Amino acid sequence: HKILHRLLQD
Amino acid sequence: HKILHRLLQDS
Amino acid sequence: LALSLTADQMVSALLDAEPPILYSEYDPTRPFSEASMMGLLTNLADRELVHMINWAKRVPGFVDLTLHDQVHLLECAWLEILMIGLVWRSMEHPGKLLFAPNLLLDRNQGKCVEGMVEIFDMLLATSSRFRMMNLQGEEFVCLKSIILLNSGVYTFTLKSLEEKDHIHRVLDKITDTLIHLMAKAGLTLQQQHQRLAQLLLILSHIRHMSNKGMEHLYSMKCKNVVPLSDLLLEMLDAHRLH
Amino acid sequence: SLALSLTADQMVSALLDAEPPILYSEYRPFSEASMMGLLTNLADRELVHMINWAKRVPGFVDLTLHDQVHLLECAWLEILMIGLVWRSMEHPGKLLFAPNLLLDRNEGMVEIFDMLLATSSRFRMMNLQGEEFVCLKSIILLNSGVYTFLKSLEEKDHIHRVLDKITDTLIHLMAKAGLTLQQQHQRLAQLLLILSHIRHMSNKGMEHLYSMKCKNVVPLSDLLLEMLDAHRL
Numbered sequence: 001h002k003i004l005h006r007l008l009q010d
Numbered sequence: 011h012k013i014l015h016r017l018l019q020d021s
Numbered sequence: 022l023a024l025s026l027t028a029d030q031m032v033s034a035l036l037d038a039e040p041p042i043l044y045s046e047y048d049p050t051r052p053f054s055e056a057s058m059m060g061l062l063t064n065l066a067d068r069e070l071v072h073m074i075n076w077a078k079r080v081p082g083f084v085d086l087t088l089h090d091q092v093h094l095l096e097c098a099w100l101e102i103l104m105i106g107l108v109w110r111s112m113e114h115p116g117k118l119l120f121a122p123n124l125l126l127d128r129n130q131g132k133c134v135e136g137m138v139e140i141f142d143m144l145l146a147t148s149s150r151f152r153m154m155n156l157q158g159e160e161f162v163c164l165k166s167i168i169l170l171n172s173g174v175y176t177f178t179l180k181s182l183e184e185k186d187h188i189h190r191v192l193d194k195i196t197d198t199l200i201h202l203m204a205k206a207g208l209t210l211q212q213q214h215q216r217l218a219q220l221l222l223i224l225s226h227i228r229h230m231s232n233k234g235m236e237h238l239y240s241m242k243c244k245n246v247v248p249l250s251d252l253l254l255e256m257l258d259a260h261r262l263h
Numbered sequence: 264s265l266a267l268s269l270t271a272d273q274m275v276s277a278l279l280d281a282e283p284p285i286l287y288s289e290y291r292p293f294s295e296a297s298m299m300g301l302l303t304n305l306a307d308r309e310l311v312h313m314i315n316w317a318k319r320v321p322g323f324v325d326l327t328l329h330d331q332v333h334l335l336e337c338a339w340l341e342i343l344m345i346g347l348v349w350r351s352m353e354h355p356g357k358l359l360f361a362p363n364l365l366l367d368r369n370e371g372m373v374e375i376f377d378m379l380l381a382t383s384s385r386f387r388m389m390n391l392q393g394e395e396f397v398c399l400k401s402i403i404l405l406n407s408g409v410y411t412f413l414k415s416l417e418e419k420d421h422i423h424r425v426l427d428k429i430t431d432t433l434i435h436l437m438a439k440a441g442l443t444l445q446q447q448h449q450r451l452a453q454l455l456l457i458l459s460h461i462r463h464m465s466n467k468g469m470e471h472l473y474s475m476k477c478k479n480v481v482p483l484s485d486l487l488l489e490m491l492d493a494h495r496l
């Protein structure tokens with residue numbers, strides 16, 4: 001679960 | 011450095 | 022949609038999405054070390070990335086894409102994006118790099134970071150170029166948006182070719198926008214496409230500054246010179262580097 | 264001076280006229296060492312030729328030798344790659360390194376291979392024209408190393424003037440092919456932006472060529488070695 005991926009949903 | 015130098019003069 | 026945006030709406034959005042200039046943790050009580058300075062840049066970048074992500078989302082067309090794709094574009098362009106910003110804000114600062122309002126360095130100062138100077142020279146060079154052409158803000162954000170869509174599009178089953186094509190359509194609008202701008206700037210037709218060429222050619226050197234930037238970072242990493250954020254680690258990773 | 268007096272069509276005819284020959288490779292299965300041998304053997308020979316084409320790139324002989332050296336030291340691998348890409352176009356899923364050496368993606372060079380193939384997929388999807396390709400190729404030569412440059416300011420000035428010409432020439436080409444103004448600009452943009460992807464493949468290959476170097480797995484010519492020397496120094 002890459003960091004960037006989650007940051008791109010917040 | 012130098013081979014290229016000499017090719018660019020070759021005629 | 023981004024394709025029904027006009028030129029002037031295209032420009033308004035981008036200027037409106039622009040990130041803030043962030044300050045460095047600059048501690049003027051000690052002299053720089055290699056480790057310290059690098060710390061400062063990696064701390065700054067780390068914080069710019071978070072804002073960057075939010076900027077990308079406001080780049081027209083960009084939210085139309087799957088997360089995996091957004092992830093990829095960003096992983097490809099992040100350092101180009103940081104460097105083109107740095108160059109831009111360094112514009113009016115001849116001989117210096119304005120990483121932050123409190124971190125304005127010259128080629129003499131990056132001295133203590135092994136291998137940084139070459140990249141410093143390049144960036145100051147790009148800045149003198151933008152200065153000499155008189156790069157405008159409206160043109161800068163266009164360039165910056167181009168870099169984000171472009172850099173990783175080549176490196177993109179059936180939903181793939183629609184996504185590609187989508188990005189190409191969007192890049193075409195920004196091209197239309199760059200031209201709009203120059204026309205409005207009172208440029209002749211000839212000067213428009215000459216200018217458009219000069220700026221797009223500048224991206225080549227920015228891709229190039231990035232690649233050298235990346236490899237230098239990997240070596241600070243591989244030397245345990247500076248701790249890198251879990252985000253930095255991951256973005257440097259993407260470049261599967263060595 | 265003479266480069267700034269050429270016409271759109273004289274520019275084009277001079278560049279098609281300087282176009283290098285498609286050289287051949289060496290004529291069982293491949294070892295790692297054997298494969299890269301052919302590539303670097305090929306590349307070396309192609310270098311000798313590329314130097315002669317550069318001298319016939321209008322504007323190029325106007326410069327000093329330091330500067331041709333520097334331009335060629337920066338551009339060389341980009342030049343090679345856009346040739347392979349251009350030659351590979353009409354062979355979907357393959358790289359035509361030479362007529363006898365036509366490979367598919369079937370250590371580390373695979374990522375590079377995938378990029379070159381994508382570049383060729385692009386050129387294909389755009390239907391790049393030959394006249395367009397030789398222009399792009401000259402752009403690469405004059406562009407790549409000018410940033411990293413009143414003896415000097417004039418020379419840059421010169422190269423940038425030559426570059427606008429090649430760009431005028433690219434536009435001629437597309438107006439001639441009957442595209443609208445909007446489409447000339449879009450198109451011009453699309454082709455310049457590929458150069459960014461080419462500069463990127465080249466920076467990557469340079470590093471891969473640097474490990475294949477440190478490895479002594481593959482002899483490299485004294486030229487090939489010096490040209491790789493320039494990218495570290």
Ligand SMILES: Cn1c(N)nc2ncc(-c3ccccc3)cc21
Nearest residue numbers: 062065066103107120234237238
């Ligand atoms: C030159 N450089 C390298 N080698 N690694 C770097 N990481 C980040 C930056 C950066 C961070 C914030 C603003 C401007 C530049 C610069 C870097």
Ligand SMILES: Cn1c(N)nc2ncc(-c3ccccc3)cc21
Nearest residue numbers: 302306343344347375468471472
């Ligand atoms: C990726 N790569 C490495 N590492 N070393 C290389 N040497 C030559 C080429 C090459 C030569 C002619 C056409 C296209 C590529 C590519 C190389």
